[PDB]
Amino acid sequence: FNILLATDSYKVTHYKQYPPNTSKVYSYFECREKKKYEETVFYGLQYILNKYLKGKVVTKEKIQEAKDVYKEHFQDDVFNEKGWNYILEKYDGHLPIEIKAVPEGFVIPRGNVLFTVENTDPECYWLTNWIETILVQSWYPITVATNSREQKKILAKYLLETSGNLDGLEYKLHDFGYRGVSSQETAGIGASAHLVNFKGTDTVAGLALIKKYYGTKDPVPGYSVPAAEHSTITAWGKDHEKDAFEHIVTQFSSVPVSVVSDSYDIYNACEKIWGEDLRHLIVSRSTQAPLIIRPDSGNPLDTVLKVLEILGKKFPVTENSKGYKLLPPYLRVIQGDGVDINTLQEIVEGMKQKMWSIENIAFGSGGGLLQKLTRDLLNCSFKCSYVVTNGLGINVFKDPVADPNKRSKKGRLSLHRTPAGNFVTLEEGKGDLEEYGQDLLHTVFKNGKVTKSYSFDEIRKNAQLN
Amino acid sequence: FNILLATDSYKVTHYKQYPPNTSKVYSYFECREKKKYEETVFYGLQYILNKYLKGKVVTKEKIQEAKDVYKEHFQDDVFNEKGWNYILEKYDGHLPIEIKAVPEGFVIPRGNVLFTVENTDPECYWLTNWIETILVQSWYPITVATNSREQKKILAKYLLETSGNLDGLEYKLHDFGYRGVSSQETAGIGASAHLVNFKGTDTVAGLALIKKYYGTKDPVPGYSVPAAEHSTITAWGKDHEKDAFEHIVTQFSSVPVSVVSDSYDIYNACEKIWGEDLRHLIVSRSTQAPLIIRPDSGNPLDTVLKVLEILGKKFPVTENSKGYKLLPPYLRVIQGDGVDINTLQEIVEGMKQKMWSIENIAFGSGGGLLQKLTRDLLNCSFKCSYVVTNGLGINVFKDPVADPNKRSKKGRLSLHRTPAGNFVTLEEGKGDLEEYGQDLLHTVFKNGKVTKSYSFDEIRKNAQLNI
Ligand SMILES: O=C(Nc1ccc(C2=NNC(=O)[C@@](c3cccc4ncccc34)(C(F)(F)F)C2)cc1)N1Cc2ccncc2C1
Ligand SMILES: O=C(Nc1ccc(C2=NNC(=O)[C@@](c3cccc4ncccc34)(C(F)(F)F)C2)cc1)N1Cc2ccncc2C1
Questions:
Q1: Which of A240, A249, A332, B423 could covalently link to A236 via disulfide, CB atoms 3.0 to 4.6 Å apart?
Q2: Binding-site residues, ligand 2, Cβ < 6 A
Q3: Are B380 and B31 in contact (CB under 8 A)?
């Protein structure tokens, strides 16, 4: 990794574009309000600070590699070799940058300052926005954590309504997304962001990221159970689906086991194979080791409702203290196909209308959870708000005539508690009036060192639901 | 990197679920047809083979790390330590796997085998599908290359129609997506996939990936020009936008230079600042060093058409030999906001209806090009189609009653040219009847070695448009 090659090409040319005698560039990150995701989990900057920004990030060799690449890339010698040599010689390759940030896991309304960046040496005025590209990739862990939290809110509401408690809430949305993301690095970041809110993952890459960058008191931040795939059922042959199911639930007799049941006919598998031929191997299992039947095709709501209606007529169903139907504790369902925040809401509402407890169901989500998200969903954006030029500070901003939603904030920013205990971003250095007490941003990075950090356990606490 | 920790958790348990006495698992990858992205660029597998699958990928230390993690993760000791030790001791940690693939850059219709995977040692029947998760991530470079190519087709059609050639086609869609992707690793892979079809990138990460994994005869696979951002304009102050523009075009007098012009009022910047106050610094510039005006907000079609209407009244417009209007060569426009395959089509059709040449415009795309894509867009999917159990081969598949589109192929697969020059995937080992040409799948990986590689130059040639 070479930070000289980890910016948008055009930023290589910015040191020639700022007003002459500019000693300070001060820039901020927000999830811009779009005058429905009203609050965001701030998570993921600490990963970036440690993996990419801290310590000696400049060497002789990195400067020469970048020089040689940019000469060809631009067909011209526009690279700031002198500016990067300055950092190597004055600071042993440590970035003279100060970043202030809201604590990780914090849950903040749209349109607030989340972090700020500024150069600490006048010579490095160009450096603040060099690192915009790398820091703005924060959008991804923020957006995965936020969208996973919104899904937890829906699950919380319906589980509380149909059961009278939240037992098992943190295992209700399992991460199926490892194959469905764009890379290994993405797998680990996105899986880690989902584990801010839940404990169930198949995306193994998330576990090592958490242990190296954040830390947990527990040995691991997330858990799984044995489960089949189409290959482990269909490999027995089209006439032997029963043989496959029997061998798998017998191999995994004393732990929970998920068994994909839609290879040929989900409704026949539920009613005849599980519900009649193999019923004796299901009703014997312990409460700690249920069979989880997994449909994987068809309309997600219609399929879930028919699977439950089938199982309800083959297995002894109870009515819980809320009046909702409940499968025996040895038998559960997981819908792991077509789940995103919209279909999840549809399935739990539909279950509730048919008097099925959300105790009966778990969800798996892959692309919906980790991939089908963009920087646009929360308007994650980094902008310059303040510069010093000829020793005078100026409040700077954009305000495009055709889109007032892209207006940016002015001047030096701070984050405060309101008298009602909400959040407000103060602009134009007005935080210094101290009419709203102390800035909630903390210095997290300064002059190549991480100065403040959060365990994963602290992050989970900050991100809890009301 | 530990390949023992680079699979979906449940696959750690699959070695206990396959039929006993199974000596072979054979699986394939396709972009399943949904019975419109009718053809897919196969690109990206070579990166995965070299970065993650080749050489000694198993050590004593990796097996113990995986053992310790899976113990806690499953609350149980279900990990296949003996199976992974077998690979370490018999093959010095090299995977006994054979992968066959269509050549990279090939352009293949939906619903065809692109690559196959099978174990070369009976002991390692479980290994074929262990590596499903890592191989299925090839969806991403395939889908970025495919979607970038479909955009090149749209640009090709409209540029040929409004100008009578394709000059500059390979610079018409610039990658703006570095900040808009989910990771550094993703930036490099997605940027490299876009450069299969175009030469203009700001996503620097793509250049080193191409040089390390593919290689080009040219020094670099992709190029950029100097350009402003809101910070380099707004830093001058709200009352000095004109000073910022003047200093920037004067700093970059002799090369092309893109200047974001919507900080306060794009229409005032075009009509009064560029079109009157600074016009003398624009009309002097060379054909090799145009000013590119960059709007960055509003309705993308409406804003492009009004920018061109303004510039057409302040600058000398010509009518090209097709009847379409053309800005002077020192002046161009780039729309780099809200561009995806749908808005791109809308803008060029709108320009065509208003008699503007596509010569006037370049596009920048960020999230649309590199991030707003999923494995579902081309139904990229990996399935087991053949096993050997008790020495007998059987053709296996799924065929869910409620979704016939998820039906999978049966048996040993091969890819062939049809008598009309199309493609066909043969099932059930029917390739061995040799009623069609050679199988187009080549061994690219075997027993821990990459056996066949493609230069990036070969991939660009394979992925060219017809015309
Ligand atoms: O079906 C898959 N995995 C799976 C299925 C169900 C659950 C459960 N979630 N939630 C729960 O509460 C269960 C559960 C009960 C008791 C103790 C559990 N311990 C740890 C966690 C879950 C526990 C419930 F059985 F009670 F539903 C089980 C977890 C994972 N697959 C993995 C995968 C990956 C990629 N693509 C497809 C698939 C299929
Ligand atoms: O505007 C940006 N960059 C940029 C702008 C225009 C082009 C051109 N594209 N296509 C071309 O044909 C141009 C062009 C002509 C002549 C020689 C060129 N040489 C190399 C390539 C482009 C050449 C055209 F001037 F003719 F339009 C110029 C390339 C990059 N930005 C970079 C960026 C990154 C992230 N976010 C926002 C931005 C803004």
A1: A240
A2: A 8, 10; B 168, 171, 174, 176, 200, 202, 223-225, 227, 256, 258, 290, 292, 294, 332, 334, 336, 362, 364
A3: yes
